[PDB]
A paper describes a structure:
Voltage-gated Na+ channels (NaVs) rapidly activate upon membrane depolarization to allow passage of Na+ ions into cells. DIV is followed by a C-terminal tail which contains a structural domain (CTerm, NaV1.4 residues 1599–1754) consisting of a five-helix EF hand-like motif (EFL, helices αI–αV) followed by a long α-helix (helix αVI). CaM is a small (148 residue) ubiquitous eukaryotic Ca2+-sensing regulatory protein. NaV1.4 exhibits a unique CaM mediated Ca2+-dependent inactivation (CDI) which results in a reduction of bulk Na+ current by approximately 30% after the elevation of cellular Ca2+ levels to ~10 µM.13 In contrast, NaV1.5 exhibits no CDI even at elevated Ca2+ levels.
The crystal structure of NaV1.4 CTerm Short (residues 1599–1754) in complex with (Ca2+)4–CaM was determined to a resolution of 3.30 Å (Rwork/Rfree = 24.0/28.5). Crystals belong to the space group P43212 and contain one complex in the ASU. The NaV1.4 CTerm shows the same fold observed in the higher resolution structure with apo–CaM with helix α VI in the same orientation which indicates that this helical rotation is insensitive to CaM’s Ca2+ state. The crystal structure of (Ca2+)4–CaM in complex with NaV1.4 CTerm Short shows that the C-lobe of (Ca2+)4–CaM binds the IQ motif of helix αVI, in a pose similar to that seen in the apo CaM CTerm complex. In this complex Ca2+ binding does not open the C-lobe’s hydrophobic cleft; instead, the C-lobe is fully Ca2+-saturated and yet maintains a semi-open configuration. Unlike in the complex with the apo–CaM, in this complex the C-lobe does not form any salt bridges with the NaV1.4 CTerm although two residues in the CaM lobe linker are involved in salt bridges: Asp78 and Asp80, both with Arg1740. The N-lobe of Ca2+-CaM is found in an open configuration, in contact with the Nav EFL, with a shifted center of mass (3.6 Å shift) and with a reduced BSA relative to the apo CaM N-lobe EFL interface (334 vs. 495 Å2). The hydrophobic cleft of the Ca2+-saturated N-lobe is open, solvent exposed and unoccupied in this structure. Even though the NaV1.4 CTerm construct used here includes the entire post-IQ NLBM previously identified in NaV1.5 CTerm (NaV1.4 residues 1742–1753, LLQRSMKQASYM, 67% identity to NaV1.5), no N-lobe binding post-IQ was observed here.
Residue numbers in the entry:
A (entry chain B): 7 to 147
B (entry chain A): 1611 to 1760
Amino acid sequence: EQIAEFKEAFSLFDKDGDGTITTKELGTVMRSLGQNPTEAELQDMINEVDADGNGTIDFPEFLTMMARKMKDTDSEEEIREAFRVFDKDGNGYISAAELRHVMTNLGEKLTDEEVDEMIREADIDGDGQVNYEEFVQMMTA
Amino acid sequence: PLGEDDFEMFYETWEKFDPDATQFIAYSRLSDFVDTLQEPLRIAKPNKIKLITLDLPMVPGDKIHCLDILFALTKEVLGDSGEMDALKQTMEEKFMAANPSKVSYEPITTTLKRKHEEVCAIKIQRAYRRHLLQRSMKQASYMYLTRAAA
Ligand SMILES: [Ca+2]
Ligand SMILES: [Ca+2]
Ligand SMILES: [Ca+2]
Ligand SMILES: [Ca+2]
């Protein structure tokens, strides 16, 4: 198995490169991304992947966390964040434009027809828009 | 070793990566810019992760303003003084009016953001595609299973 890419991720949350991740470094990265964590919340997040009680997180613990998430669980919390990211204007609905714009990004060249089928099968209500409930249903099972 | 020469030198090699004097650079082009830079302000060649961490704002589409790059490179080497923050604001007004070309004032995206969006997007396309394969597989086997029973 290849850990080649997980190092880039570890580097992102390590500002000083001291080989560990504190609350403060993690909080810094979250805030820049658009989310406010409470101080207590940052602590619990740190604890879950904190094997050796240290209070910070080096590549071993980080690697284990990545391995745990390696299974494509596709949890609702993970999905919720994606919705937050794609819902550019924050109105609680993802318009076609928003999602269609995401296709241009590098991850995969979803064809326009493929994207249209994504919208067709997700928009139950029938109003040209994905809300959170439809988006979750589309991505669950 | 910050000096007088470095600032003219930053503004010089801007013409190398932007002869057209657009004052904007495609994000992909940026990594090489900072590699081929003056010694104090230079960032080592493996610099994609740093650029991501810098959060330089990008205007549509994927265009970063001359100043943002500049001040971010200096305040990397140098401390984040209040005067610089004020100085850039004054400079911003001078540059815009000065520019003959006209564009909207605000950019809605930054590199950190962009990297999360690319990550989150991959996760969704990867999941969507896998979900599809499963449906097809299930449909084929079931069809064969019923047909065989018949
Ligand atoms: Ca650290
Ligand atoms: Ca630890
Ligand atoms: Ca929206
Ligand atoms: Ca809807």
